[PDB]
Amino acid sequence: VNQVATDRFIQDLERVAQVRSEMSVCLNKLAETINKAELAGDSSSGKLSLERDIEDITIASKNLQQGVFRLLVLGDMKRGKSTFLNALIGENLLPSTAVLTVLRYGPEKKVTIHFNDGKSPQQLDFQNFKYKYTIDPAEAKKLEQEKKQAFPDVDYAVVEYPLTLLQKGIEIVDSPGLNDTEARNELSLGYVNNCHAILFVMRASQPCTLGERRYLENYIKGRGLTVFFLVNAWDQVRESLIDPDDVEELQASENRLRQVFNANLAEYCTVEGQNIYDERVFELSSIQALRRRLKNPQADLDGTGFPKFMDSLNTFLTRERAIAELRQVRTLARLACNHTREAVARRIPLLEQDVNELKKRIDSVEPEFNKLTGIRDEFQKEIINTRDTQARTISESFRSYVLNLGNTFENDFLRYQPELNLFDFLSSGKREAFNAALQKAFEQYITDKSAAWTLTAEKDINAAFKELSRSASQYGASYNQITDQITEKLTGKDVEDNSPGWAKWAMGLLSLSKGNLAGFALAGAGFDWKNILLNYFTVIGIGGIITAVTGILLGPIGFALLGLGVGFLQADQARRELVKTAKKELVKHLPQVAHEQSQVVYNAVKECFDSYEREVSKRINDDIVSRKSELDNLVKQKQTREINRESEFNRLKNLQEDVIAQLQKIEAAYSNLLAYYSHH
Amino acid sequence: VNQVATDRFIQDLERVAQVRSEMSVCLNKLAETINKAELAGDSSSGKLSLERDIEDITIASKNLQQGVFRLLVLGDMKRGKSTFLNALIGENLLPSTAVLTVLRYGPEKKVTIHFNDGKSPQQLDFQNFKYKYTIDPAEAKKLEQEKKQAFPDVDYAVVEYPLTLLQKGIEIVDSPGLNDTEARNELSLGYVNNCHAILFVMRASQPCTLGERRYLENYIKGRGLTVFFLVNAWDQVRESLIDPDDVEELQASENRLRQVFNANLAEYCTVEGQNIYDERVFELSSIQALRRRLKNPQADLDGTGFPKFMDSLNTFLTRERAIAELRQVRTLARLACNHTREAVARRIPLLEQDVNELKKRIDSVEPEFNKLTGIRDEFQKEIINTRDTQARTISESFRSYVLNLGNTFENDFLRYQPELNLFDFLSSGKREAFNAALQKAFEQYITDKSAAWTLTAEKDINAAFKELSRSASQYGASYNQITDQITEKLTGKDVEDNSPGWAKWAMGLLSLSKGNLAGFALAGAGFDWKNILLNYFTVIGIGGIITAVTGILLGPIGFALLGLGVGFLQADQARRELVKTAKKELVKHLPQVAHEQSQVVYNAVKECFDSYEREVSKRINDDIVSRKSELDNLVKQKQTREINRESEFNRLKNLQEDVIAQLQKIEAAYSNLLAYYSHH
Ligand SMILES: Nc1nc2c(ncn2[C@@H]2O[C@H](COP(=O)(O)OP(=O)(O)O)[C@@H](O)[C@H]2O)c(=O)[nH]1
Ligand SMILES: Nc1nc2c(ncn2[C@@H]2O[C@H](COP(=O)(O)OP(=O)(O)O)[C@@H](O)[C@H]2O)c(=O)[nH]1
């Protein structure tokens, strides 16, 4: 019958959730199989040394169960975020919320809240929670005049609720505002870079506010994020026409409005040169959608804008993000399958050969193994000569940037009009409650300048890793050759892209983490954790610069202030000096403080590349070492126990079948789910 | 036929405009008549000494032509003020205005703008003016984060336009915002106290904002002003109901909303104990009214809320303010008529008596005249012993208040969170561009505290003048008796409230100024000019207190600041001192600065009562002196010229008729206009 798109969403979601689950199943089965066989190893012809795969496959499975689509819902004050969500999840839940709220599936309506001032994760009931954590439009505009946070004792609150949408694997993060303090919090907790998509609610009666346009630039622009812009309260446009019942006039006003959003959002709706504006921007009437879902949740929403929007989001999540993520699981399973497969194909034959003939064959390949180690060294160098070059060139960029900011300060000092909270200043006394006060006053300035640079930084670190990838690809290709030989000189018989395993990780085609510190958006969930780590330290930098230029000018200021309240200095006499002193002190230290500060940025860029090196290293040594033990364990047995060669044959032939069997089920689940899409 | 209320308004207005005009006519005629006769005086039996009446009557007339109803239209950002006005005056004039705009009748669409930075009153065309003086919702919220004024080089702009409403005698003052800077400007230019009514546009989607509620308290509460609250965009309430087409549900939401406005506005809709809330608060849909007036200006507005509102405003203006004002003109005319009448009735008879018999009769009353001077002295004392007592008790009140504000400063310092504009601070250097910066930061605090006290001050000055009035009443009563005798002992034949003239002014029953410095709201237009003069000096006071406590603490601060940026003082070491110093200095000067400041408030209260004394004096001496010259001029002639006693008789009998004739026409115009209302 009339299949509403709200059904299609729940359907697809459910479907995926099944593929996800079924793979999880095979993955364990696969792990359990490689594992049992490996334990039997010592009591037989020795282990095959497949522990790295067991582990990897095990994490992969555990990841698959905890799988979920995270959506970050951003939006300014009173735009409809609340009503919007209710409409989306078909309930009148949120109150038509002054604190980051994570909405997730749960059996009972519960609400636990995590603090930051120390307090251990409390607990409450939505009934009381709704009253304890909210703000009247009055005392909320008040905590706005000072750009302060509502409850800084809270990091975020979680809300479990029986909502079928959340059941099928959806988590919602509802951000309370666009201000900068709340911004960092979200950035620091991950979110902005730990969610599959961003839902940025806007309103037709307030087209791309300065507040919005600013946020977009400081936190979204060129950061490679998927964000759908929902122009809410679209229905209001017509309640202002000469004739609110003239589709032609209406259309014309809507058009006036539409060229405004396009002008400001086009820039954010493109993917690799291709423009997808109308698959990301949606004119909506949340109030009309909600109303309809209140008379019947299986209600058709055509006319509210929702359908068109939901189908895009459905597609993105279930036919793109799921595929990519699922595909990786297949890749990991094929790796496990092959390593096992080949390992066995190498052993069975060596089982017949005698200890002497064996060590002769093993020594035969010693030169090949060392070559592998040549790659492990040749690539490690390059890896490090890249961190060094990068951690240098960037530190330079920052140092140079901070300094040069001083050449424009005057003009900027005017554009931004730092407001100093006189109460915050005096109030306490800690050499922090006084510096924070000044730090706040320069919040917008710090954020802006700060966000701009890290964009530039990231654009480079990206390319770096993009090269290292291409590099690993080739080293991987040769590594394989050297590997093929080790098999031939051992066995006698010479046996997606099929590069080695460690190569798969180094290229960012695979990964067990949702995110990583390189530009690998095809790895894991794709999440860019270097926007966190980077655009956080940089703030400490550009802020320290202030925290520094602060202690630099206090003295000169205090002098002027003091030399006036006593009468030693007259009006405008101290100002021809405060300056004389300022300029003097700055040109006397700024360059040093810049340099001193650009040393934190150094450690951050060095870190990015040290994580990568640390991992790629593990995996490569891990390969080398296992292939070698593969051979050593045999000898350790031929000289110690006595194996029944034919029973070993079945046991290992069995191992091989059982694993492949599992891989196929997975390969199927994937193919089927894909094919289903071929016909829909 | 279907007479729309927009017609009734234009009608009534027109009608009044006629009565007003006709009286103006008779007034001149009356003045011209007393004048011609007076010139003939020297060549005849001498002047009657009616110059005070000629003058008074002449001003009264000139005032009558320049007559107009002034409306102050207040309102927050984006509430509908603009759309509202357009709907009111049936045009799509204002742009759906970042500067006080005075909208008045004019032949050609013109726009002159008066500055304050010096520039001489420029000039423009609405075409260009519309573009040169406006602000995008963007760069307008920007000049909001710092609570600054858009164009401080402008005081206001006037806009002449061919609008029949303005023709019939209506002026509109459209205020751009509720902020405090714009507030003072309006207060300083008069407006808030130089307009017959205030139109405070509010919006249903933003019920009594903090911004609004604050304004109301600081500028309207207990100030005796007439303000109509227009709850605009009332239509929007239903676009949020489960079912927007359920009058019952609607009504219930409206009710939820209605108890909010009543709770906050009731307080402002009462007159002498009587509550008239629903004659002042009006739920409106400006957008629907405008639309209808675009298809036809003679359009019925029933259903928009406008009709109900307009009729109240019509009533207030044309059947209350006009009456009161017109009635005064009648009072002034009766005074002129009587003074003339009686003067003549005293002379004709003395014309027969011979010089000797005359001086005998004149000397006969010398004791009576001195008695009159006894009143002129007995009342002048009291007048002055009242200014002294008041200018003292108030100065005390202020001094005491300023000091005591210090006992609560800490708590207040928290409530208000003074933001200091770091740019403004440093920037220049004048011992003003630095103090202003600090003055601004404390704007809200100064305004609030300041406005509160002057309310208290006014409540007293009122009573003072209310007493002086009652006092004058009685002195007037006796003055009359003494006057009656002077006539009897002279003539032989013993000849609204009918107190003497000077008594009429002292009681505030009459006045040639729209406003005055006493609580006389029955005098002139009623305007309270002591809310201007008073609530302006007080700001200079509570602000100077700051400007003072500023220079008091600079030194201690500068010391702490300086003793930190050099390392002589550690963190939280200087703060146990900044305080040590603060408290020390304040308790060491505040009391003196308070006292020094409470000396401006002294001059303001002394002024109020000196204006009153100055005037009441003039009028009383003026009476005494004329009545005396009345007698002297006769003698000056009986001894110098020779008059034809019978011709003088006709000339003066004529004078008498001609004046009375004019008074009657006026007495009629008034009575008729009133009676017309008796039947409508
Ligand atoms: N006409 C219309 N009004 C809306 C729409 N969405 C929300 N509103 C109105 O805005 C109010 C709710 O704002 P809200 O959702 O709480 O803002 P939020 O808390 O920032 O998400 C309600 O009273 C609605 O009347 C919409 O799509 N169309
Ligand atoms: N629904 C509704 N909208 C209104 C009403 N009055 C004004 N508006 C809307 O508010 C906007 C105009 O705001 P405006 O009058 O310029 O605010 P102002 O400049 O502060 O007076 C228009 O786009 C209208 O759609 C009203 O009575 N009802």
Short mmCIF file of N, CA and C in Angstrom, two decimals, chain A residues 76 138 141-142 145-148 209-210 213 235-236 238-244 287 291 294 413-415 417-431 434 438 441-442 551-552 554-559 561-562 564-566 571-572 575 578, chain B residues 138 141-142 145-148 209-210 213 235-236 238-244 287 291 294 413-415 417-431 434 438 441-442 551-552 554-559 561-562 564-566 571-572 575 578:
data_model
loop_
_atom_site.label_atom_id
_atom_site.label_comp_id
_atom_site.label_asym_id
_atom_site.label_seq_id
_atom_site.Cartn_x
_atom_site.Cartn_y
_atom_site.Cartn_z
N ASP A 76 20.72 27.33 15.65
CA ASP A 76 20.70 28.51 16.49
C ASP A 76 19.51 28.52 17.45
N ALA A 138 14.14 34.29 28.79
CA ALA A 138 14.61 35.48 29.49
C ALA A 138 16.02 35.30 30.05
N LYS A 141 18.81 34.77 27.43
CA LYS A 141 19.31 35.85 26.60
C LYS A 141 20.28 36.64 27.48
N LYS A 142 20.16 36.42 28.79
CA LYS A 142 20.99 37.08 29.80
C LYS A 142 22.38 36.44 29.77
N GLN A 145 24.41 37.83 26.76
CA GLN A 145 25.01 39.15 26.74
C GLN A 145 26.47 39.09 27.19
N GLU A 146 26.84 37.98 27.84
CA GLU A 146 28.19 37.79 28.33
C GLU A 146 28.87 36.60 27.68
N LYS A 147 28.18 36.02 26.70
CA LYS A 147 28.68 34.86 25.96
C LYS A 147 29.18 33.74 26.87
N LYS A 148 28.44 33.47 27.94
CA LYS A 148 28.79 32.41 28.89
C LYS A 148 27.95 31.15 28.68
N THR A 209 22.12 33.69 9.21
CA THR A 209 22.50 34.70 10.17
C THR A 209 24.02 34.88 10.15
N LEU A 210 24.50 35.94 10.79
CA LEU A 210 25.93 36.19 10.87
C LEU A 210 26.42 35.03 11.74
N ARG A 213 26.59 31.81 9.45
CA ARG A 213 27.68 31.96 8.50
C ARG A 213 29.06 31.87 9.15
N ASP A 235 6.97 27.19 5.81
CA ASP A 235 5.58 27.57 5.64
C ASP A 235 5.32 29.05 5.89
N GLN A 236 6.12 29.65 6.75
CA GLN A 236 5.94 31.06 7.09
C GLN A 236 6.12 32.05 5.94
N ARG A 238 4.83 32.32 3.13
CA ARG A 238 3.65 32.86 2.49
C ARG A 238 2.75 33.72 3.34
N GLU A 239 2.95 33.73 4.65
CA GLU A 239 2.09 34.54 5.50
C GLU A 239 2.49 36.00 5.47
N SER A 240 3.17 36.39 4.39
CA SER A 240 3.65 37.75 4.26
C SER A 240 3.48 38.30 2.85
N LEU A 241 2.79 37.55 2.00
CA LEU A 241 2.56 37.95 0.62
C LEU A 241 1.33 38.84 0.51
N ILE A 242 1.25 39.62 -0.56
CA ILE A 242 0.07 40.46 -0.77
C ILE A 242 -1.09 39.49 -0.63
N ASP A 243 -1.00 38.39 -1.37
CA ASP A 243 -2.01 37.36 -1.35
C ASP A 243 -1.34 36.05 -1.00
N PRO A 244 -1.52 35.59 0.24
CA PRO A 244 -0.92 34.33 0.72
C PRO A 244 -1.41 33.09 -0.02
N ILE A 287 6.64 22.01 11.85
CA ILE A 287 5.38 22.16 12.55
C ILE A 287 4.24 21.41 11.85
N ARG A 291 2.55 17.83 13.48
CA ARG A 291 1.10 17.76 13.57
C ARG A 291 0.52 16.49 12.93
N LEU A 294 1.04 13.30 14.73
CA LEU A 294 0.35 13.23 16.01
C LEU A 294 -1.02 12.58 15.83
N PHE A 413 41.61 44.54 16.03
CA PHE A 413 41.20 45.04 17.33
C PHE A 413 39.95 45.88 17.21
N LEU A 414 39.75 46.45 16.02
CA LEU A 414 38.58 47.27 15.77
C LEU A 414 37.40 46.41 15.34
N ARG A 415 37.63 45.56 14.34
CA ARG A 415 36.59 44.67 13.83
C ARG A 415 35.95 43.96 15.01
N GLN A 417 35.39 43.60 18.91
CA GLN A 417 35.44 44.65 19.90
C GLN A 417 35.40 43.93 21.22
N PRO A 418 36.53 43.31 21.58
CA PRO A 418 36.69 42.55 22.82
C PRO A 418 35.99 43.23 23.96
N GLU A 419 35.11 42.49 24.63
CA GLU A 419 34.41 43.05 25.78
C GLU A 419 35.01 42.35 26.98
N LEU A 420 35.51 43.11 27.94
CA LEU A 420 36.11 42.50 29.12
C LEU A 420 35.09 42.52 30.25
N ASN A 421 34.82 41.35 30.82
CA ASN A 421 33.86 41.21 31.91
C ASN A 421 34.45 41.74 33.20
N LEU A 422 34.22 43.02 33.48
CA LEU A 422 34.75 43.64 34.68
C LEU A 422 34.57 42.81 35.94
N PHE A 423 33.48 42.07 36.05
CA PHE A 423 33.27 41.27 37.24
C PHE A 423 34.27 40.12 37.26
N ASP A 424 34.37 39.40 36.15
CA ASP A 424 35.28 38.28 36.05
C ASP A 424 36.70 38.72 36.37
N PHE A 425 37.10 39.86 35.82
CA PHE A 425 38.44 40.39 36.01
C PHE A 425 38.82 40.45 37.47
N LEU A 426 38.20 41.38 38.20
CA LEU A 426 38.46 41.56 39.61
C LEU A 426 38.06 40.32 40.39
N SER A 427 36.77 40.20 40.68
CA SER A 427 36.21 39.04 41.39
C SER A 427 37.22 38.28 42.26
N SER A 428 37.74 37.17 41.74
CA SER A 428 38.71 36.35 42.46
C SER A 428 40.10 36.99 42.50
N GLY A 429 41.12 36.21 42.15
CA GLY A 429 42.48 36.73 42.17
C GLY A 429 43.51 35.80 41.55
N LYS A 430 43.17 34.52 41.43
CA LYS A 430 44.08 33.55 40.84
C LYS A 430 44.63 34.11 39.53
N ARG A 431 45.90 33.84 39.24
CA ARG A 431 46.50 34.32 37.99
C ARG A 431 45.89 33.53 36.83
N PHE A 434 41.81 35.85 36.25
CA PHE A 434 42.12 37.18 35.75
C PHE A 434 42.53 37.06 34.28
N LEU A 438 40.38 37.87 30.42
CA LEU A 438 40.95 38.48 29.22
C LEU A 438 40.92 37.50 28.06
N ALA A 441 37.26 37.66 26.67
CA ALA A 441 37.12 38.86 25.86
C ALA A 441 37.65 38.69 24.44
N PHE A 442 38.64 37.82 24.25
CA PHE A 442 39.20 37.62 22.93
C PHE A 442 38.78 36.30 22.31
N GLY A 551 50.46 39.19 29.91
CA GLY A 551 51.45 39.45 30.94
C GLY A 551 52.53 40.40 30.46
N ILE A 552 52.62 40.58 29.15
CA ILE A 552 53.60 41.48 28.57
C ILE A 552 53.15 42.92 28.78
N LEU A 554 50.50 43.97 30.93
CA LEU A 554 49.95 44.32 32.23
C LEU A 554 50.75 45.47 32.84
N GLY A 555 52.03 45.22 33.08
CA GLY A 555 52.90 46.22 33.66
C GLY A 555 52.76 47.60 33.02
N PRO A 556 52.95 47.73 31.70
CA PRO A 556 52.82 49.03 31.05
C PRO A 556 51.45 49.67 31.29
N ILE A 557 50.42 48.83 31.32
CA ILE A 557 49.07 49.32 31.55
C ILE A 557 48.94 49.78 32.99
N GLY A 558 49.17 48.85 33.92
CA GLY A 558 49.07 49.18 35.33
C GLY A 558 49.77 50.50 35.62
N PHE A 559 50.93 50.69 35.01
CA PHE A 559 51.68 51.91 35.19
C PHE A 559 50.82 53.09 34.77
N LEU A 561 47.58 53.28 34.23
CA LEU A 561 46.40 53.38 35.06
C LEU A 561 46.75 54.05 36.39
N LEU A 562 47.77 53.53 37.05
CA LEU A 562 48.25 54.04 38.34
C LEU A 562 48.78 55.47 38.25
N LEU A 564 47.83 57.72 36.81
CA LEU A 564 46.75 58.63 36.43
C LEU A 564 45.85 58.83 37.64
N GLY A 565 45.55 57.74 38.33
CA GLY A 565 44.70 57.81 39.50
C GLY A 565 45.37 58.48 40.69
N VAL A 566 46.61 58.93 40.49
CA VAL A 566 47.36 59.60 41.55
C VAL A 566 47.77 61.00 41.09
N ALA A 571 45.96 63.38 31.30
CA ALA A 571 45.22 62.71 30.25
C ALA A 571 45.99 62.74 28.93
N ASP A 572 45.94 61.64 28.19
CA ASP A 572 46.61 61.53 26.90
C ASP A 572 48.12 61.76 26.98
N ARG A 575 49.07 57.72 27.29
CA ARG A 575 48.77 56.97 26.08
C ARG A 575 49.82 57.12 24.99
N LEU A 578 51.92 54.38 26.83
CA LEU A 578 51.42 53.01 26.87
C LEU A 578 51.81 52.37 25.55
N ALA B 138 21.97 41.99 10.00
CA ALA B 138 23.30 41.49 10.33
C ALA B 138 24.13 42.54 11.07
N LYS B 141 22.80 43.63 14.52
CA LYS B 141 22.89 42.78 15.70
C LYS B 141 24.33 42.92 16.20
N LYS B 142 25.19 43.43 15.31
CA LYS B 142 26.61 43.65 15.60
C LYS B 142 26.74 44.87 16.51
N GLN B 145 25.84 43.92 20.16
CA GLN B 145 26.73 43.17 21.05
C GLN B 145 27.56 44.13 21.91
N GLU B 146 27.61 45.39 21.50
CA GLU B 146 28.37 46.40 22.22
C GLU B 146 27.47 47.51 22.75
N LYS B 147 26.17 47.32 22.58
CA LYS B 147 25.17 48.28 23.03
C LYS B 147 25.46 49.71 22.58
N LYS B 148 25.89 49.86 21.33
CA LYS B 148 26.20 51.17 20.76
C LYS B 148 25.08 51.68 19.84
N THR B 209 9.24 40.75 26.85
CA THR B 209 10.65 40.43 26.91
C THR B 209 11.26 41.07 28.16
N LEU B 210 12.48 40.67 28.50
CA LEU B 210 13.17 41.24 29.64
C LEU B 210 13.42 42.68 29.19
N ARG B 213 10.01 44.65 29.63
CA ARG B 213 9.73 44.81 31.04
C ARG B 213 10.68 45.80 31.72
N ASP B 235 -2.11 36.98 15.00
CA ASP B 235 -2.53 35.89 14.13
C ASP B 235 -1.66 34.65 14.24
N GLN B 236 -0.39 34.85 14.56
CA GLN B 236 0.55 33.73 14.66
C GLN B 236 0.23 32.69 15.73
N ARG B 238 -2.26 30.96 16.37
CA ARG B 238 -2.89 29.72 15.97
C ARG B 238 -2.09 28.81 15.05
N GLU B 239 -1.00 29.31 14.49
CA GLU B 239 -0.22 28.46 13.60
C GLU B 239 0.66 27.50 14.37
N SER B 240 0.27 27.22 15.60
CA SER B 240 1.05 26.35 16.46
C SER B 240 0.18 25.40 17.27
N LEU B 241 -1.11 25.38 16.98
CA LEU B 241 -2.06 24.53 17.69
C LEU B 241 -2.11 23.14 17.06
N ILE B 242 -2.56 22.15 17.83
CA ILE B 242 -2.70 20.80 17.28
C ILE B 242 -3.51 21.01 16.01
N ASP B 243 -4.62 21.71 16.16
CA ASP B 243 -5.50 22.01 15.05
C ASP B 243 -5.67 23.51 14.98
N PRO B 244 -5.02 24.16 14.01
CA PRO B 244 -5.10 25.62 13.84
C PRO B 244 -6.49 26.13 13.49
N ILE B 287 -0.24 42.75 9.84
CA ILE B 287 -0.06 42.18 8.53
C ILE B 287 -1.39 41.97 7.80
N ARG B 291 -2.59 44.43 4.51
CA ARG B 291 -3.07 43.76 3.31
C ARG B 291 -4.44 44.27 2.84
N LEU B 294 -4.53 47.63 1.29
CA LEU B 294 -3.81 47.71 0.02
C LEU B 294 -4.77 47.46 -1.14
N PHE B 413 27.05 44.34 41.48
CA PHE B 413 28.18 44.12 40.59
C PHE B 413 28.09 42.76 39.95
N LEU B 414 27.39 41.85 40.61
CA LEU B 414 27.22 40.50 40.09
C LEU B 414 26.02 40.44 39.16
N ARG B 415 24.87 40.93 39.63
CA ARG B 415 23.64 40.95 38.84
C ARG B 415 23.96 41.54 37.48
N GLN B 417 26.61 42.70 34.77
CA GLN B 417 27.95 42.19 34.58
C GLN B 417 28.59 43.14 33.60
N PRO B 418 28.94 44.33 34.09
CA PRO B 418 29.55 45.40 33.30
C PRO B 418 30.55 44.84 32.33
N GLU B 419 30.38 45.15 31.06
CA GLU B 419 31.32 44.69 30.05
C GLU B 419 32.10 45.93 29.64
N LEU B 420 33.42 45.87 29.73
CA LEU B 420 34.22 47.02 29.36
C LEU B 420 34.75 46.82 27.94
N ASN B 421 34.49 47.78 27.07
CA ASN B 421 34.92 47.72 25.67
C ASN B 421 36.41 47.99 25.57
N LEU B 422 37.21 46.94 25.63
CA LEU B 422 38.66 47.08 25.57
C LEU B 422 39.14 48.03 24.48
N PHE B 423 38.46 48.07 23.35
CA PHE B 423 38.89 48.97 22.29
C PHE B 423 38.66 50.41 22.71
N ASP B 424 37.45 50.70 23.18
CA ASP B 424 37.11 52.05 23.61
C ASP B 424 38.09 52.54 24.67
N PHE B 425 38.39 51.67 25.62
CA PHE B 425 39.29 52.00 26.72
C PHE B 425 40.59 52.59 26.22
N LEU B 426 41.42 51.75 25.62
CA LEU B 426 42.71 52.16 25.10
C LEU B 426 42.52 53.18 23.98
N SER B 427 42.23 52.69 22.77
CA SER B 427 41.98 53.54 21.60
C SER B 427 42.62 54.93 21.68
N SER B 428 41.81 55.93 22.03
CA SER B 428 42.28 57.31 22.14
C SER B 428 43.14 57.54 23.39
N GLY B 429 42.81 58.59 24.15
CA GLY B 429 43.57 58.89 25.35
C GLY B 429 42.97 59.98 26.21
N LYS B 430 42.08 60.78 25.62
CA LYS B 430 41.44 61.87 26.37
C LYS B 430 40.90 61.31 27.68
N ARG B 431 40.98 62.10 28.75
CA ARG B 431 40.48 61.65 30.05
C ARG B 431 38.95 61.62 29.98
N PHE B 434 38.28 57.45 27.84
CA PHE B 434 38.69 56.41 28.76
C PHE B 434 37.64 56.28 29.85
N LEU B 438 34.31 53.34 30.56
CA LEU B 438 33.89 52.79 31.85
C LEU B 438 32.46 53.21 32.17
N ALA B 441 30.19 50.75 30.15
CA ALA B 441 30.14 49.48 30.84
C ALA B 441 29.13 49.47 31.99
N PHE B 442 28.88 50.62 32.60
CA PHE B 442 27.94 50.67 33.71
C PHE B 442 26.63 51.32 33.33
N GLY B 551 38.13 57.41 39.07
CA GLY B 551 39.41 58.04 39.34
C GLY B 551 39.92 57.70 40.73
N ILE B 552 39.03 57.20 41.58
CA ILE B 552 39.39 56.82 42.93
C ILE B 552 40.15 55.51 42.90
N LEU B 554 41.44 53.93 39.97
CA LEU B 554 42.44 53.75 38.94
C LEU B 554 43.80 53.44 39.56
N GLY B 555 44.30 54.39 40.35
CA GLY B 555 45.58 54.21 41.01
C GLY B 555 45.76 52.85 41.66
N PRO B 556 44.87 52.45 42.58
CA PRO B 556 44.99 51.14 43.24
C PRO B 556 45.04 49.99 42.23
N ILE B 557 44.26 50.13 41.16
CA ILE B 557 44.22 49.10 40.13
C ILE B 557 45.53 49.10 39.37
N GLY B 558 45.85 50.24 38.75
CA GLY B 558 47.08 50.35 38.00
C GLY B 558 48.24 49.75 38.78
N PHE B 559 48.27 50.02 40.07
CA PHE B 559 49.32 49.50 40.93
C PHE B 559 49.30 47.98 40.84
N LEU B 561 47.85 45.98 38.68
CA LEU B 561 48.14 45.52 37.33
C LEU B 561 49.64 45.57 37.07
N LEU B 562 50.24 46.72 37.35
CA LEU B 562 51.67 46.96 37.16
C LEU B 562 52.54 46.07 38.05
N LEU B 564 52.27 43.33 38.79
CA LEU B 564 52.07 41.94 38.43
C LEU B 564 52.79 41.66 37.12
N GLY B 565 52.66 42.59 36.18
CA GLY B 565 53.31 42.44 34.89
C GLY B 565 54.81 42.61 34.96
N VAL B 566 55.33 42.84 36.16
CA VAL B 566 56.77 43.02 36.37
C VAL B 566 57.29 41.98 37.35
N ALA B 571 50.29 36.19 42.09
CA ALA B 571 48.86 36.02 41.89
C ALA B 571 48.13 36.00 43.23
N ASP B 572 46.96 36.63 43.26
CA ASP B 572 46.14 36.68 44.46
C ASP B 572 46.85 37.31 45.67
N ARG B 575 45.31 41.12 45.01
CA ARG B 575 43.87 41.20 45.22
C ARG B 575 43.47 41.30 46.68
N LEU B 578 44.20 45.14 46.48
CA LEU B 578 43.34 45.98 45.65
C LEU B 578 42.12 46.30 46.50
#
